[PDB]
Design a protein around this ligand. Structure first.
Ligand SMILES: *[C@@H]1O[C@H](CO)[C@@H](O)[C@H](O)[C@H]1NC(C)=O
Ligand SMILES: *[C@@H]1O[C@H](CO)[C@@H](O)[C@H](O)[C@H]1NC(C)=O
Ligand SMILES: *[C@@H]1O[C@H](CO)[C@@H](O)[C@H](O)[C@H]1NC(C)=O
Ligand SMILES: *[C@@H]1O[C@H](CO)[C@@H](O)[C@H](O)[C@H]1NC(C)=O
Ligand code: NI
Lengths: 555, 555
């Protein structure tokens, strides 16, 4: 009978055996309230502490998830993890039970104080749940406590009128409240509040970075951050026109009045289902509801905050996957796995126009970008065209921003580590020609290969996948334990790996803007330098110069 | 007693043994007049046939060379072959005996009709002599007749008033006259007038290409062309402001009168040395005296003629050397063999402004070129900077023009072959870090390694140099024999090679604009595709687009 007494009352967890003969069991505390329900007058308001209870509260099953709709095709596939979009039937079972009363977290405890890794999920800020990420294997394997969190999503978590009526960022404030709850109560579970690492993939990674830029993350709250395939600098990390979308939403539900306070009060009267089901489309590659620059939680544009080093110095780990942008080209690839020269020019031109605006003069940007992403040493290959087009989207939305983020963190003294993920397990839902796509590193970080194929992750993981997952978890948990991916657990070959550990002699060197060393995570691992340096510098150095040659405007 | 009766009279040659035990001797006919002396009223006039003689004329020693000055530092080192500029003391001995009466050619005959290879020398159109190129080894080894030619140089060979007073191109007309003489008389020496191949390096290669664009090269005159490191499309292949320089020269010698006919008549009265010794400097990277677009010999801009396929369909072979542009950077390299970021920016910017003119608006060209030639994967390496800067000059002045030439020839049906020369023998006069420079292929084509170091080519040639020279001569002479570098002599290993022939299994595939297959000539030979495709397309496609973004002007 796993009982723990927290500052709010006694809680009962549940022991769970893992589907691996080597891994020990864990104790799970599911559906733990970390804040009061954000309902009634508390909708569109910062989270309040949870109410205490006098008996023993059971935490043996997941609590309802935050309101969302993932079955009507409103989800931006180019932004969400492929494992999620390709397995909607299973994902749906995890979010079938919903409620506005959804501020709960899950704790996985292995059977001195242990490091705590807090996972922040996120695809587009509109959907998901930490419940989708089983932290059992990571906890048991790395001997760390793993926590998954549910924070307010979409409209309920991010609506903002651009003024005092609704300041936005409720979902981020929930994450901060979950971190405060953890800091104050995890010791009761055997956790170390002085060694808290927050990690997340995709929009979850964006959340991680945004938290490091907020003064609400007081010194000492958490110590390290791991942002996988997600930054605060991408076009879809922040909502820059919140008021516009708040009013479009209001108009659709019959609440669009002149006064913003009355508008919000009206929205607070609506059944949450009504707000969630409306179709509010943002510009392509951008978001409608999400983090906003309120001047308080998020003090200014993240780019400015980063350039000016407006963040505490956490230990930082970040990276990207070889082929993040799969969904960007998957639909235009012909039956021969190739992309035509015409589809290529069309795709590149439209992407540039949406991100940089239409030129009011003679174009130079589109012409230059098409030239740069054309393999002149093999310009006739339709498959190579597919590859370079995919690389363009990957470089622009993930690689460039990640490098810009790494450069600034190291420049300002944050111990930084960078990785490029070049491995994955292909399911029957992904093209045979595809490389690791957005979200593909998640199963490895969570140790799914160690417990075999699951409903959520059905790929038939190989022994090499198990070995690689073990390697990744060792680096990730070493980082959680010391802020150094190499300490204290060496990369050795043990029965758990099932195959020789190919990283035995690979020390993950710290990243610096000068050498830019990074870990190439794959079956042929090694530390390399200047990840895709040519394309990264094209986007960060040359393009801005060319962009300023003309006046541009959007629509 | 080597006697031959030509259409103009009997000529006596001289037998010559070669410094190689395997090679047979050759009969040399040196100083054979192929035209009448272009003196008096014949200065600045097309060449006339030579006068016949009734006795036996001796052709056992070189005739005086055409007027020139190579000792006062007026020679543009960036344009001339390195072996020439680095060994002026020896070169000077070959041009010490000069005369305006200089239209003579040299014939090398091996001891059915044999193919004839006519070598056209040329550094900047102002200096040199075919006498510098001993065709003995090529003739003996390949069993072909080799001819070297002396044509009018500099002022005497190319002065033009831009009108009828002096139409220019006298030196080119001399080459045509030498080819006509060869066509009509080489059979008397055992040569085949139906298999005449013209070849040349540097400005000599430019001459070769210009001849293919002239209507004066009537169908049947010659059948094949080999242009080594030289085209008719480079900035220094043609003189575009002839009148301007004709008048600057006239002013310097006291002949600048208003009437162009009177100006020319005055120049015709001057001692040739007076015209040769004047310092007439053209714009950097351009020429003052050289081929001009007269609308007759050269009907229009070579670029236009090439785009429109205005040339007969010859068998063509063309190529470039790995590091042509050595002299462009050699002087700015520090004692550490590197180039600073500042010197790099300065060199690139100045080169671009000279070739493209100064922009009258915000620059885009300089910024883009600097970005393209920066190795972002090793941006801190000063030696890499040296290499990329050298590559920039090489790509622009030699590679791009050669590829443009090859593409057009193949597009219009000319059987085309392309090579990249990646081997050389370093003398103690060139930097240890340098790769094959401009003119470095000459010793190999001429078989110099077979006879050991010479006064002109003092490098201590290795066994591999001998082997490679043998390989090159086989490809070149096979081309002369059949128009196909692979027939009829196979690339086998014989005692003459001294080392195993590394090209035994390397068939030189024909070049096409689609596959752009070329022969990589080096110690690790093989046919490759799309030589430096990225940089070539940058210059041929992207740059022209960026150039048109602004109005540009020169000074
Ligand atoms: C809590 O769980 C216990 C053990 O399964 C059960 O007996 C009880 O009915 C549940 N509800 C509570 C909190 O009493
Ligand atoms: C909501 O009302 C305001 C003021 O009446 C108006 O400006 C706005 O367009 C309306 N919202 C929309 C987009 O329909
Ligand atoms: C030509 O060469 C021959 C043989 O060396 C020599 O006898 C003669 O004097 C030379 N002069 C001429 C033109 O006969
Ligand atoms: C030569 O004379 C002409 C006309 O008298 C003049 O235009 C030209 O500038 C003179 N040549 C030079 C460049 O000195
Ligand atoms: Ni000017």
């Amino acid at each position: 009978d796993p009982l723990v007494t927290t500052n709010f009352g006694k809680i009962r967890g549940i022991k769970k055996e893992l589907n691996n003969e080597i891994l020990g069991p864990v104790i799970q505390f599911l559906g733990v309230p970390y804040a009061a329900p954000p309902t009634g007058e508390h909708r569109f308001q910062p989270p309040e502490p949870p109410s205490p209870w006098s008996d023993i509260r059971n935490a043996t099953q997941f609590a309802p998830v935050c309101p969302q709709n993932i079955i009507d095709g409103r989800l931006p596939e180019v932004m969400l993890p492929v494992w999620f979009t390709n397995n909607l039937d299973v994902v749906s079972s995890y979010v079938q039970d919903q409620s506005e009363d959804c501020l709960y977290l899950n704790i996985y405890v292995p059977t001195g104080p242990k490091p705590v890794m807090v996972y922040i999920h996120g695809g587009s800020y509109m959907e998901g749940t930490g419940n989708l990420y089983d932290g059992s294997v990571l906890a048991s394997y790395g001997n760390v406590i793993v926590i998954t969190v549910n924070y307010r999503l979409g409209v309920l978590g991010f609506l903002s009128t651009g003024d005092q009526a609704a300041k936005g960022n409720y979902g981020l404030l929930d994450l901060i409240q979950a971190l405060r709850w953890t800091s104050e109560n995890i010791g009761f579970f055997g956790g170390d509040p002085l060694r808290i690492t927050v990690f997340g993939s995709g929009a979850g990674g964006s959340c991680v970075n945004l938290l490091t830029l907020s003064h609400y993350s007081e010194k000492g709250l958490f110590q390290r951050a791991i942002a996988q395939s997600g930054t605060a600098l991408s076009s879809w990390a922040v909502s820059f026109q919140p008021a516009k979308y708040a009013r479009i939403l209001a108009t659709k539900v019959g609440c669009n009045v002149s006064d913003t306070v009355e508008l919000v009060e009206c929205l607070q009267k609506k059944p949450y289902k009504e707000l969630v089901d409306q179709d509010v489309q943002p510009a392509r590659y951008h978001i409608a509801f999400g983090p906003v620059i309120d001047g308080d939680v998020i003090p200014d544009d993240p780019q400015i905050l980063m350039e000016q080093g407006e963040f505490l110095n956490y230990d930082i780990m970040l990276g990207v996957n070889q082929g993040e942008g799969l969904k960007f080209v998957e639909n235009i690839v012909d039956s021969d796995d190739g992309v035509s020269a015409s589809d290529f020019d069309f795709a590149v031109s439209n992407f540039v126009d949406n991100l940089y605006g239409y030129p009011e003069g003679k174009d130079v940007l589109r012409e230059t970008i098409k030239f740069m992403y054309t393999d002149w040493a093999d310009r006739h290959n339709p498959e190579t065209r597919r590859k370079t087009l995919l690389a363009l989207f990957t470089d622009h939305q993930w690689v460039a921003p990640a490098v810009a983020t790494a450069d600034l963190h190291s420049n300002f003294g944050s111990p930084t580590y960078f990785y490029a993920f070049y491995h994955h397990c292909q399911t029957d839902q992904v093209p045979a020609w595809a490389d690791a796509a957005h979200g593909d590193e998640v199963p490895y970080v969570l140790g799914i290969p160690m417990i075999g194929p699951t409903e959520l992750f059905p790929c038939n993981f190989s022994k090499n996948d198990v070995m690689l997952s073990a390697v990744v978890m060792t680096y990730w948990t070493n980082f959680a334990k010391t802020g150094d991916p190499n300490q204290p657990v060496p990369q050795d070959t043990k029965f758990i790996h099932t195959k020789p550990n190919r990283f035995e002699e690979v020390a993950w060197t710290r990243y610096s803007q000068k050498d830019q060393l990074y870990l190439h995570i794959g079956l042929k691992p090694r530390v390399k330098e200047h990840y895709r340096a040519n394309k990264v510098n094209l986007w960060l150095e040359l393009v801005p110069h060319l962009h300023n040659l003309n006046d541009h405007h959007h629509h």
